[PDB]
Subunit: 258 residues, 4 copies
């Protein structure tokens, strides 16, 4: 009765923030969904129940996406529990703000690893089944920072730019098939991290801390929501997007337009 009914989706890093919002919107559109976090937590059962309110099959699998063997374990688990992975959402929020000169090498490596190389490993693992089955959606959660630069975000802008380049190549290698690969580029979203960071900067520096943060970059002077990012994923996963290939859906309140 719904546009993604019966489709099996995996959303990496979906226990909070944008990834959870995407999982919620895919389930709301009918998809069965595998949630993923780095480690098991007491809250995980509650998060499953939240997504399960949309009446589809929901599962949870703990896996560190920097470890190729655990990425493989996540795909195999999905195949055992639900069937083939049909919709792969490569989502990874890790950020670190620092000028280039003092940017820690281990943080640089981790941002590249999780935001770019983990998407390669998961895509590599999922493509053979998608080709056999004649259908697939690979949806890479990039950023405005994949299209433009911002100060003190060198690793993140590099990784997100790279994820957009990767998206184009996967789409070209699958262009004659029922598999598409595209990227979503959000602007500022009010994530759990951001709500803590603004509340902390307001108590030290409220609606005025929020306005200063948004006004520099985001002409709408409002946040993008996790539901809006999820709605872009649902659109890319739908039949109307059968010929949307290798492109970006930018949800940013005007950031890249100026």
């Amino acid at each position: 009765k719904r546009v993604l009914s019966g489709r099996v989706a995996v959303v990496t890093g979906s226990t909070s923030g944008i990834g959870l919002g995407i999982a919620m919107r895919l389930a709301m559109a009918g998809a069965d969904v595998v949630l993923n976090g780095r480690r098991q937590s007491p809250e995980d059962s509650a998060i499953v129940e939240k997504v399960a309110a949309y009446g589809t099959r929901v599962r949870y699998f703990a896996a560190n996406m920097k470890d190729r063997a655990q990425v493989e374990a996540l795909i195999k688990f999905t195949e055992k529990e639900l069937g083939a992975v049909e919709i792969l959402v490569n989502n990874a929020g890790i950020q670190h703000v620092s000028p280039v000169e003092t940017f820690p090498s281990d943080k640089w490596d981790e941002i590249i690893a999780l935001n770019l190389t983990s998407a390669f490993h998961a895509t590599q693992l999922c493509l053979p089944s998608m080709r056999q089955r004649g259908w697939g959606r690979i949806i890479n959660i990039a950023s405005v920072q994949g299209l433009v630069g911002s100060m003190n975000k060198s690793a993140y802008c590099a990784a997100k730019h790279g994820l957009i380049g990767f998206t184009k190549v996967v789409a070209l290698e699958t262009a004659t098939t029922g598999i598409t690969c595209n990227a979503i580029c959000p602007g500022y979203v009010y994530t759990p991290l951001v709500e803590e960071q603004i509340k902390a900067v307001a108590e030290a520096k409220m609606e005025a801390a929020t306005q200063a943060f948004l006004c520099e970059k985001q002409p709408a002077k409002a946040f993008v929501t996790v539901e809006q990012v999820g709605d872009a994923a649902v659109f890319l996963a739908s039949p109307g997007a059968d010929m949307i290939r290798g492109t970006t859906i930018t949800v940013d309140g005007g950031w890249v337009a100026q």
Copy 2:
């Protein structure tokens, strides 16, 4: 349905992409005003095809190059259905020619219909959208608004220009409930595109349309398949929906990979 009650105007919607957009908006619940350069015997049939989806459908003939007729189209919509809430600027034309011999009149007409008419229609609709606090302006650009192709100088210029205009309107409305965005299709099987293929078929392939279609598509479109008017319409419905309240000043490219390579 996601657009139920909303009043939409689609310019150049008697065939091809414009008709496909109008069809999809009506399916999503919008009332729709169709438009063509001139009244046609088949206009009444086209209205009924779009009316099959149970919304209010009207037709108004108007030459989009004439600012007075653009104004007449908007006032006709306000009288028959109500304030314009979704404006789709689509009417366009094509002319294939090397730059040196490109006819001056054809250059001017392509700029006027593909770019300046969108400006005029947008100018006329924004005051009401601002007063009501909601609007969608959806400009039908092209892959040719992001990249160039040989022998399409005027079209690429006009479509690039329409994308630039889209950004400015979006920025001037960014703090409102009005969004402005562009859809960029690749090759769509339309009567016009079919003519382009016909021309290639006789010049290069002995009139064989199957061989010419594949050669035509594979030059530019990695999917080796056409984009459909239904798909362009589905992108328009997405941009008009609430999930797109924060999509502003951007392009939705529906092109089988053309701009990815």
Copy 3:
């Protein structure tokens, strides 16, 4: 002796601002240069003298670039006086700031006509000679506003975006020849026209304080917090006209202090 020695260049709208800076730098690089303004002015001979300081041949021709007949007359004048047009710089600064709802129709049309359609006409008229000779440069002066939008500049952003699209097509149609076509995209440049734009802002919002208005004007858009200069735009034109750019085709050289990078 210099990298463009002996090349004949035509720079439209070159009696002030960016066009004059381009003419100056092309002459410095050895090119003979034809200057152009909309109409004759008392200052024309002094502008000729400025460009002629670099030891090349210089001419001046008044022509309204909106009128295709006068564009043709400019090209024929150059052919008579100096020789075949080898470097064509399509340059036009016209601007009008207004929200879209009240943007005057005649100003919209003027901006499209001068910033886009005039380039098409001049390119059409110059391409046959360049093709016959197997060499050419068409350099279109676009803007950052041809790559991104800015509030209250709908017509200019549309025209400059269009000029970049036109650039790509001309480049593709000439890609197997010695003719190249590219665009330069300046940010905010220190010119009389831009100073008039800043003065309007200073009077409207900063109590006449040109320093404060300039700071805010640049800070809004240009991360360098400093102007691009007309000499720098001219240096980009010299680069595109040089042999090292024989395979630079259909692209943008953006000179903007970081504007489009963010």
Copy 4:
């Protein structure tokens, strides 16, 4: 002789013993810069390459360093500082390529391409920026590719790395925008190099039965409208332009030298 546009400036070009890197080193030296060349390891040919670049009358040196090893990148910068002076022009060039569909792309090759084509540029830039800021002048010139702006089949790692290098370029430029330091990228298309000759050799042997002229036009015509190669000298000319005073306000952008590839 008379002073030249880059006289007195000290440049380091990574991966400059052949190909694009060598062409850039040559053109910088011709423009008056002192130049430190770099290769992965000591080879019998290093003397000959130094002397070629030194023919233009500037100070030229050679240092062997694996750019994947941050300690060796640091040794390269310190070697330059000791032998010639502060590094003023950094050209991040050392690259590698590997053509494979995504499904079978080897993990070690993916990591190597990311490490050399992206992370090495970050390390070298980090090491050079403090001195540039103290002196109030610098040029960081990153050698990207058309593949940093568009995708191509079977080049997933390379396109990802070169896209990432362009994103990095923007951030460095923005962090330095109010200084005399600029950072920009050059995006070549197909360049006549032994490496790209190998790519045509692979296509020639696999589809054209060893023929090379037929493959060459087919190889170029797919992607490069000029139907001709870009030259290492032209890439070098773009680097000289970015290093020159006329580019003081060119920041965070790309100079695409590609025969029209990205224009269509």
